[PDB]
Design a binder for this molecule. Structure first.
Ligand SMILES: Cc1cc2nc3c(=O)[nH]c(=O)nc-3n(C[C@H](O)[C@H](O)[C@H](O)COP(=O)(O)OP(=O)(O)OC[C@H]3O[C@@H](n4cnc5c(N)ncnc54)[C@H](O)[C@@H]3O)c2cc1C
Ligand SMILES: Cc1cc2nc3c(=O)[nH]c(=O)nc-3n(C[C@H](O)[C@H](O)[C@H](O)COP(=O)(O)OP(=O)(O)OC[C@H]3O[C@@H](n4cnc5c(N)ncnc54)[C@H](O)[C@@H]3O)c2cc1C
Ligand SMILES: CCOC(=O)c1ccccc1S(=O)(=O)NC(=O)Nc1nc(Cl)cc(OC)n1
Ligand SMILES: CCOC(=O)c1ccccc1S(=O)(=O)NC(=O)Nc1nc(Cl)cc(OC)n1
Ligand SMILES: Cc1ncc(Cn2c(C)c(CCOP(=O)(O)OP(=O)(O)O)sc2=O)c(N)n1
Ligand SMILES: Cc1ncc(Cn2c(C)c(CCOP(=O)(O)OP(=O)(O)O)sc2=O)c(N)n1
Ligand SMILES: [Mg+2]
Ligand SMILES: [Mg+2]
Ligand SMILES: [Mg+2]
Lengths: 582, 582
């Protein structure tokens, strides 16, 4: 029973209705940056005793913070901006939240309704702009539609395949007085009628049946299983099938397990790709068959009966036609298939040890390797130190690049929603703000941003947010003085011809530039720079033990390459297993 | 006669065609940030000996740099980004370039054509997103369309009412081989048929006739006159009409002149608004009748015969119906009206000294004032020092806020394209990157960014660009520790209730935060912080005399208010002439 700060018959500003609409949705943290077209909302936010605002230093940081808030908690992330330039600074976060299916609700202020379409001051058609990069969006044309639109926005952003929903609110609506009707029925008939139903035992038993007829099965787990953590583990006990995870599904099934194949795909392990390439049953649970995972579709799992479970009926048969398909929640499919596998325990000769010991051969012949030159810090080793020193129980956000792949390969995430990384859109500068949101959603957790010198500087202004809000965000900066991932593609396919990939100062090429420590200093954040591999363990330990924020500039040799690598559009018979720019 | 780096019969990559297409357009500076979907363009850029790339640290900085490059030179500004997140980071710059009519050409890489529409890696429909915030955009579907599309893009971006044109180039097109045909005819029939013709003497003489019948005329000069600098001055000699300029048209007619009324509008001078409010002839040359200038349209110049000249037929009669109108280049209209005013010199009793001395009364009764408390640096005075110490011949870019208005009121720009500021979209963080572009377009000019502690930090990462590229960008930071413009609206209309407008550290509220000097230090830029008004003159002098970049942190009392102020939707009878949050 909600307790409003206003009488049920007392007229209140539309902005006070909007904030109360968030309170009734369980919202307790928003990332709002004020502006003229949204001051009424910001005023109403201060009147709320249950909603906290984390003021960012850039709206792109605000939306990415709402993402990290959402990815690390399963709750929807809420960011607020003003009209015009404030709204356009959310675009990257919206497109990023859509491609990775992150529950997000963005509220932008808008010019008064009479001004819309007149090219007014700070007036951009943010609805017309974001329609293709949002799950849905709204334009509030009357103050009485606020309670319904907010309820539809949160429902749409969190139900089914989650995504971002934008709600444009004109300024006059925020100022208008009304008595909100909190029991309007959501005008979503066509959406709920197509919401997936619990899976039929007809399909579920044919899958269990296909598991027993199979001899080389592989699990293809992705971002759809982030809530099916326990159900996936219990399903693996009853079958013993190896688990190849995607960059989004990392943590669903523990990486430190002997049945885990870690990540598959372009920069996935040689053995996980092998298991898929020579399998007869592919259990694709909560994946979207990305080109970063399949490459050439005709060659992807070209000997396997593909069983695809997905809550989005559009993704089923989108890029690869499966044998069996189940439109629905993969959580329920596992629950149903687990009951079928217990009551048929002794009836099913379930033992794939012949298949697993074939993989464990490839597992120990082509494992994740890294060279260690002299005392230069290998970035892969630095992350493996962070894994050990944090017991693998630390929330990890990343930017985009080599340091993003090494953060995925060389860290053993034990639970989902511990790994926050931009996968679909792959947006640099995601790490630092996502660490801000995750730290606010999980105040008593170790939150570490494994950023790169390129991605880190893009939203470096959010260091002020970390200090002001007093958040224990640890920044493990893998400084290679380059845009390494673009540099690696230059070494491989363009004869190492550098085309604007060096981020330091060419006048003093042997000086680390910029001095990231002074960035932390400007925002009153303790910092340190480690250079020799011997000092690396003590440095990371200091970063963890030092309370509050901390930036650790970890210098790395820039010629390192992320391995293995399947060239885009290739097959498993092209996986590059060694090589770097030396 | 262009000299290609390739034989006329030699097949070359589509990317090499794209770069050559820029070379043939006179391009010599681009702002490209590399990514996987645009590496082919970046490789072709290095092969070019005539095109320089200024690598930004954020694509939003890259597009804003292309803006400042364009606004300070009249040339088109060219920025390049990769697919997905690189393109979405250009959105604010595109919408900003559209609202201010800035000639700009943005080139974004895109996924291969066979991949478009499959939700591929780093694939966003950047064409579908930017269609409403660009003058036009393209999607290159064949390598042979490159020479034509680039020519149409530059023509559309620079002709008529200038604007931004986006060209999305898929990756396979960049790699495909072809012999470009550099003499394709542009498929723009409907555009050129409606391109305005030189103005008829029928309209021009009726305007000159209406000038002689008028007794209280006012010039309403805006961003449309940035190229009519000399023609406007010669027109003022022949009539003696006062010149009220807009935030965009600042510099067209010198602010230090006795006939100049400086800026009109919301934060425009009390006398310039008075001249418009009690005029019988309003010569609106190159303006779009913004709400930030008119407020209540019925009350705006409600006693004047409105003569509107504009190269965009849509803006004529859009918000205020004029008596006489001329669709065409205001430059030619001035040239024609100047000839009519010379051959009719003695025939026309042109003397408005009765009208001017009525304004010079209001001019000296309600001038631009500022209080000076103790030794605290008044921001208005700091800018007036920069005016004196640079002789008013320095290129000035700004962020958005109070420091933006004071940079407009208290600086006397003597030529147009000396004042770079986001007016239509009013996008914070515009100052620092625009100073980067203007410094590259005008290497031997004094370029000074008058940024605010909020706007400056949003794109603070571009300090690395300034150092690496060795640009003499001076940063005159007006640090008030607040989002002052939003703070002022809180003091006035919300009883000084702070709603997330303080940018410093609340734990140490009397400490300047962040330490902007350390931001400059991280990027190897000399810095200094002035606090007392006595030291202010020597500090600014040091900033100017010190070669290379320089950041001057100018601390100011935060309770200052920009005055005068006409409330949004009000009239001249509501102009607030004094008051601040004390
Ligand atoms: C530089 C870089 C390199 C990359 N390389 C790789 C790589 O080598 N390997 C890799 O795996 N990724 C890689 N990616 C990440 C990538 O582009 C995609 O995010 C990833 O490949 C696909 O993720 P996914 O299909 O497993 O899950 P998602 O992309 O998150 O999609 C979720 C899917 O599950 C479904 N779903 C969601 N919820 C449920 C539910 N409750 N029940 C049932 N179904 C549900 C949705 O409908 C959707 O179809 C890379 C990214 C970058 C930036
Ligand atoms: C915080 C803030 C406060 C502001 N307050 C004010 C204020 O008090 N006063 C103010 O003036 N502005 C203010 N603005 C700026 C503002 O919103 C608009 O940019 C400005 O009001 C309108 O500019 P303009 O009409 O003079 O020219 P523009 O907006 O640049 O439009 C150009 C017009 O001229 C025409 N044109 C272009 N080229 C030619 C040509 N060659 N020949 C003929 N016509 C041509 C175009 O078709 C167009 O109609 C403020 C901005 C901000 C961020
Ligand atoms: C910028 C917000 O846009 C608007 O809301 C707006 C636009 C056009 C006309 C009237 C209004 S209004 O009267 O409804 N409110 C404002 O104009 N607020 C406002 N906010 C800021 Cl930050 C600045 C400003 O003018 C300087 N004005
Ligand atoms: C990211 C660019 O997107 C593409 O160009 C792309 C997309 C899907 C399939 C194939 C390609 S491709 O073969 O034409 N080229 C690439 O995929 N290049 C690429 N660039 C980066 Cl920076 C990373 C990457 O995979 C890690 N791949
Ligand atoms: C905003 C933006 N621009 C461009 C890209 C393209 N891109 C770029 C420029 C990469 C290199 C990132 O450099 P980094 O320093 O942040 O990380 P590493 O050098 O360790 O790989 S990876 C990648 O997909 C991007 N992902 N995001
Ligand atoms: C990216 C963005 N967000 C929000 C706004 C809204 N806004 C904001 C937040 C202003 C205050 C800017 O603070 P500042 O420190 O940069 O400048 P002053 O405090 O000197 O006015 S002015 C204004 O129109 C904006 N213009 N741009
Ligand atoms: Mg930024
Ligand atoms: Mg790097
Ligand atoms: Mg400020």
């Amino acid at each position: 029973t909600f307790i409003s700060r206003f009488a049920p018959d007392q007229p209140r500003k539309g902005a006070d209705i909007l904030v109360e609409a968030l309170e009734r949705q369980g919202v307790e943290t928003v990332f709002a940056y004020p502006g003229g077209a949204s001051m009424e909302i910001h005023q109403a936010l201060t009147r709320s005793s249950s909603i906290r605002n984390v003021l960012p230093r850039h709206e792109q940081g605000g939306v990415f913070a709402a993402e990290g808030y959402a990815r690390s908690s399963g709750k929807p992330g809420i960011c607020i901006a003003t009209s015009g330039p404030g709204a356009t600074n959310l675009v990257s976060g919206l497109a990023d939240a859509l491609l990775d299916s992150v529950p997000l609700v963005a509220i932008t202020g808008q010019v008064p309704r009479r001004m819309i379409g007149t090219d007014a001051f700070q007036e951009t058609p943010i609805v017309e702009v974001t329609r293709s990069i949002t799950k849905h969006n709204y334009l509030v044309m009357d103050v009485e539609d606020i309670p319904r639109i907010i309820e539809e926005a949160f429902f749409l952003a969190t139900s089914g395949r989650p995504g971002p929903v934008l709600v444009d609110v004109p300024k006059d609506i925020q100022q208008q007085l009304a008595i909100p009707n909190w029991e309007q029925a959501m005008r979503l008939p066509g959406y709920m009628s197509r919401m997936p139903k619990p899976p039929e035992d007809s399909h579920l038993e044919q899958i269990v049946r296909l598991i027993s007829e199979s001899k080389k099965p592989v699990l293809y787990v992705g971002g759809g299983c982030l809530n099916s953590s326990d159900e996936l583990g219990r399903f693996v006990e009853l079958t013993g099938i190896p688990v190849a995870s995607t960059l989004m599904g990392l943590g669903s099934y523990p990486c430190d397990d002997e049945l885990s194949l870690h990540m598959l795909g372009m920069h996935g392990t040689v053995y996980a790709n092998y298991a898929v390439e020579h399998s007869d049953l592919l259990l694709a649970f909560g994946v979207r068959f990305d080109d970063r995972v399949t490459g050439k579709l005709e060659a992807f799992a070209s000997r396997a009966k593909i069983v695809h479970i997905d809550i989005d009926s559009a993704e089923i048969g989108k890029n690869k036609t499966p044998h069996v398909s189940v439109c629905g929640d993969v959580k329920l499919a596992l629950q149903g298939m687990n009951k079928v596998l217990e009551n048929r325990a002794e009836e099913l000769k379930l033992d794939f040890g012949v298949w697993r010991n074939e993989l464990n051969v490839q597992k120990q012949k082509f494992p994740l390797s890294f060279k260690t030159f002299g005392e230069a810090i290998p970035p892969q080793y630095a992350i493996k130190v962070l894994d050990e020193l944090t017991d693998g129980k630390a929330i990890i956000s990343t930017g985009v690049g080599q340091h993003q792949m090494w953060a995925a390969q060389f860290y053993n995430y034990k639970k989902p929603r511990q790994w926050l990384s931009s996968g679909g859109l792959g947006a640099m500068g995601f790490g630092l703000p996502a660490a801000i949101g995750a730290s606010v959603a999980n105040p008593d957790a170790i939150v570490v941003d494994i950023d790169g010198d390129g991605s880190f500087i893009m939203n470096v202004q959010e260091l002020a947010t970390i200090r002001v809000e007093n958040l224990p965000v640890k920044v493990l900066l893998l400084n290679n003085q380059h845009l390494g991932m673009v540099m690696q593609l230059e070494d491989r396919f363009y004869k190492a011809n550098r085309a604007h990939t060096f981020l330091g100062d060419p006048a003093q090429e042997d000086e680390i530039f910029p001095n990231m420590l002074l960035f932390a200093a400007a925002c009153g954040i303790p910092a340190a720079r480690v250079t020799k591999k011997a000092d690396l363990r003590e440095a990371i330990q200091t970063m963890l033990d030092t309370p509050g924020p901390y930036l650790l500039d970890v210098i790395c040799p820039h010629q390192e390459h992320v391995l293995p690598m399947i060239p885009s559009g290739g097959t498993f018979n092209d996986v590059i297993t060694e090589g770097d720019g030396r």
